[model samples]
Target: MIQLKNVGITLSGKGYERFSLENINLEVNGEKVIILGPNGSGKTTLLRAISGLLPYSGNIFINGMEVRKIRNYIRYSTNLPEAYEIGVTVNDIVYLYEELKGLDRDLFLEMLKALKLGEEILRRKLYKLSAGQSVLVRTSLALASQPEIVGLDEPFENVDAARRHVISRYIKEYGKEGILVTHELDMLNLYKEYKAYFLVGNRLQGPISVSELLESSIVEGERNDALLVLDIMDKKVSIVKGDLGMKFGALGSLNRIYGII
Candidate 1:
């Protein structure tokens, strides 16, 4: 199990006054968790905090051990690849992790085959993959370590629906007990079961449904921003934006998060 208590961070950017995240608490077992937030709401920062990459005042423990002192039990990654050791094969990346973790390469090899991240793909240069494929590569490396928890930021970005199926399958089987950060709320229904939370103004709220959040007024910038509740049933639907020049509110009279245009 993973537990966090009273977690908080006070950070600052160029023109913003000391930003803060406070009183965050979570308990996770071997289940999926989805965190939603608007742009720049420190969702990624929350992942960093839990990964011990950022200093914060709180307690984070994984299976009764403090996470700060037991880093290997958790794996973390963001959407954009960071500057890793360059000029290595993809196999080399998994090898480095296994060697450091005192694990064998067999498990890594097996997962690659299972995910069809095959030997040919592994033999190529690490940076040669496309942006979406790179996300899968990084995720594979992280999970191959078999950590007890994972902290992923935007793991689905640039990934098409087909790749999402494969990646989601891998995660469902091996992601363990951890938090997944994404704005693609409806994609989570694929997992069948999950705990959902919304991070806004450095505070965590809701175990609400995707339908509620979308059909509400928050996403449209119509409301001055308030907690939303709905009397609607939980419908399995996805946010159909991001494409250019999509029509809105034309299929009958249902409302959309963006507007009724």
Candidate 2:
């Protein structure tokens, strides 16, 4: 479980974006959640905040304890393999992680096999592997360790469709409860179990249903002719989309109550 109330943060880095996330309130009770947004919308910043990588004012509690106090239980997985630099074999990383965390290796081995990430890759050096393979290896460690919550930032980046599908499904089955952020919005129905959220202008809009997002009215024309007023179950669930795709939520998503796919 995770809880945040009136949460806000402002930080400055030399080359990184200077940003702030304000008055954000959210709660997650052991369910997968997707935080979708366009590039540079503070999606990564929000995840870092939740994972205790950044200091922020306001409450962020996991299982009734402050997030920083329970860092061991929160796994933050990033797209870039910056942390896993060259000159280290996959086994070297695994061994160090296992020693530091003091966990069993058998469990991780099983998870890797299940994800089709064979033992052979573990012997290869980190830099020798492909980007997608690196993603899979790191993700395998994150999921297999049995953390209470996982935060994956851009888990789909730099991967082919086939490997992406495999990794996505593997996460669905093993992710347990976590936050997944991505710029791409396709195949969202596969993550329907995750509560949907759209990060826009550094603000978060939901734990809403996927139906609410995909079914909402979208404007296709100029401002004067573009408003498509929408109603869902007598609830004003309208969010405007202009240049988005119709196939956004088409995969395995439930039909909208208003009969729109």
Candidate 3:
């Protein structure tokens, strides 16, 4: 269970303006949570804050404990290339956890295998693995602790489609309140069974249950068509099926794409 009480993060003193995260407040009880936003919209920043990896404007706590005080217990993973410590192999990582948890051998390789990595990768070095393989190994390390909070920052980035859901399902199955930071809408569809949280303008809102979104007319199909027409007049390359193949006035599909109108 993780909670943020009016939590807002900016870079510390001198570096604050250079890399600042706006005011953010949200709470994630032991459940699956998704943080979505465009670049610089603060998805990664929020993830780091929750994981106690960054400094901030407000308070962040895990199970009522301050993150700044208890950071050593959190697990945070990012898709970024620089996130992992260099000179570590897949086996070295698993061993680190095995020694820490006194865990059984069965634990580490299960998630790895599901991500399409075999036990054979244990012999390989982190530098030698492909980007996808690196992510899988880093992910393996992150999961090694099975912490009170597991924050995944675009875990599926370099992973193949066949095993994309492997981690999602794994997280859900692990019963750890998980949060996924990604731009991939399709993957969110996989975890549809869980309540979803939305981030808008750095304001966290909703565990907006799916039924609430669907049952509302504002989020429904008929309204969507009206909104599409308005967007064609504004944001979109509007194309509509017609008897003659396609149609165009000022906002015609061809005009929008070709910028010919």
Candidate 4:
């Protein structure tokens, strides 16, 4: 279980100060949750705060204990630039991680195979892997640890269509419990059983189901009580507002709707 109360973070450098996240309150208990947001929406910041990698106000608890106090129980994975810059082979990192985390080497190797990564990958340096391969390897290693609460930041960003199915299934079966953050809505159907939240303008909204989001329609103009209100191409669009169904009917693939692609 993960609980966050009034969580907020402020970032300032040079002559600017901004609230990257504010008044965020969320609770996840045994359910897979997805935080959906476009780029620059502070989704990464929220995850970093929850993982205790960044400083923030208010309280964040994992399984009834403060997050920092139970760090080992949490596994958070993002695009680790430092890892990419390192001069280490996959074998070196995997062995070291297994030793430090007391993980079973067989299980870790099994996970790698499940992600379609052969043992030969172990001999390759991290920097030599392509973007998709790196994501798969990192994700395989992360899930192998079997942490109580796993937080994955944009795990499917660079992955291809076919491999994404394999990866998502592996996560569903082995990840146990998790919070996945992404801007793309194309794969929401794969997570029908998961709860969805929208993070926009640094504010968090909804515990809406993926089913509800798919059923809802996006319409022009604003309704104060709408499920989501997005500014697209200088026009206001509202989602699930009294069943009018105008402009961009059926909220499938937000990236397409938002012209992100």
Candidate 5:
């Protein structure tokens, strides 16, 4: 179980300080969670804070222990740019994580194979791999560690549909309990069983289902069964009751309707 209570993080730079995340609270009790947000909505910041990579105010506990103290039980997937390093081969990074996590070498290799990453990739330099391949390899390594809690940041970016299907299945089966942050609204169908949340304006909203988000309609003025109400550019907008029709493509429509894209 992962629990966050009144979590907040202040980001400070040269002569400036602001709250990147404020009063964020969440609980993941052996369930999958999906967080959706536009760029600069602090989605990555929330995940990093949960992983204990960034200092945060308030409490975060994983399985009843402070997040920082239970680092071994958590695994966070790195983004494509973060994986690139000079003169580092895929095998080198894999081996390092395997050693540090005390993971089984054979299992790790097997996971790569399951993701369609072959032996040839092991010898190739990280920077040499295509964007899709790099993300795939990084995702494979994250799951291979078999951490109790996993944090995947845009795991499907630059990945093809076919591979995305394979990777999503692997995450559902192996990731156990974790948070996945993504902006690809079309991908919500892949995680229908997972709880959904939206991070907007540096705040967290909704534990709504994928169906609720897609089925609801966004309209002006107020309605009885409004899922969300917001003031966008000085105009009142409400996401209200609607049926699941082909009228909307997917949750991606929300990005358009909400002007988050």
Candidate 6:
């Protein structure tokens, strides 16, 4: 049972934005919670706030325990799920994760074997692992820590198609209570097939599944690799998927550069 109380987070000197998060409030008791939003929707900010990496004006509790002033106790899976350093080998990261979390080495290694990450790569260094291997190593570290709760941001960013589904399996098998924030629309639970979803957009929420989001264009079926250069022509700041798609805002007071609605 994770509880959030009147959490107000605002990055004062970040950039040209009002407040990262404004009086955000919610309570979660499910094993898996999905939060989907645009890049600057405060998803990462919320994760950081909960992780104690950033300061916020509110209260957060994990299983009746306060999260404030006790950052070390919470395990926050940040946006970047890569290994500690590029030079650190796979086995080295496993060791470091265990050492940092003060977990039982024997148990950790056993779990690693079950997870199929052995100690052979310890001497190699982080630069040696593939992209999938990198995500696996970091994820394995998080699992080894054995935190009461886990928060993951952009969980499926770099994972390829073949092994990406495995990530959802790991989350299901391990995390009793986990919050995942991602833009990907992959199915999380095969049995249920109804658990995956997004948390952004202005419609309804939760009842909305990942399938609907994918079909409805909340997230693109394919990765949008096109470069978007939004120009200020009207009074508003416009961000668009393509200069041809839909515009976000007006660039100037009178010179609105968008197609007819």
TM-score of model number 5:
0.82
Better of 5 and 6 by lDDT: 5
User: For candidate 2, what is the TM-score?
Assistant: 0.72
Clashes of each: 0, 0, 1, 0, 0, 11
Single out the weakest 10-residue window by summed lDDT for candidate 5. 244-253
| TM-score-better candidate, 2 vs 5 | 5
Give one digit per residue, the lDDT tens place, for model 1 in 1-261: 768789877656523667677788888787657787655667877777776677888888777877678655524333224423447887777677666543337766775566566679878777788777677777666666665667777778778787788778877776567788876654655744566676753467666544433433332222223344222223212323322222322222223422322
- lDDT measured at residue 157 in model 4 versus the true structure, 0 to 100: 78
True lDDT of residue 232, candidate 3: 21
Alpha carbon lDDT of each predicted model: 0.61, 0.64, 0.57, 0.71, 0.71, 0.53
The candidate that achieves the highest TM-score relative to the unseen native structure = 5
Model 4, 30: alpha-carbon shift in Å?
0.6
Q: Could you give me the TM-score of model 1 versus the true structure? A: 0.70
- Report the lDDT of model 5 for residue 26: 90
lDDT of 4 by residue, 12-41 (tens): 442255545668899987867999887777
Candidate 1, poorest ten consecutive residues by summed lDDT: 229-238
Candidate 5 all-Cα RMSD: 3.5
Write one digit per residue (lDDT tens) for candidate 5, span 28-90. Answer: 878778888876677877777777677888999877888778555535343324433536997
TM-score of each: 0.70, 0.72, 0.70, 0.81, 0.82, 0.62
Q: How do the candidates rank by TM-score, highest first? A: 5, 4, 2, 3, 1, 6
Per-residue lDDT of 1-261 in model 2, one digit per residue for the tens? 778888887744533665666788888877878877666667777777777777778989877888678545534333334435557898887786665444347877876676677879878998888767777777766665555577787777777777678778767776566788887766565665456876653467665655555554442222332223333334333344433434334423222312341
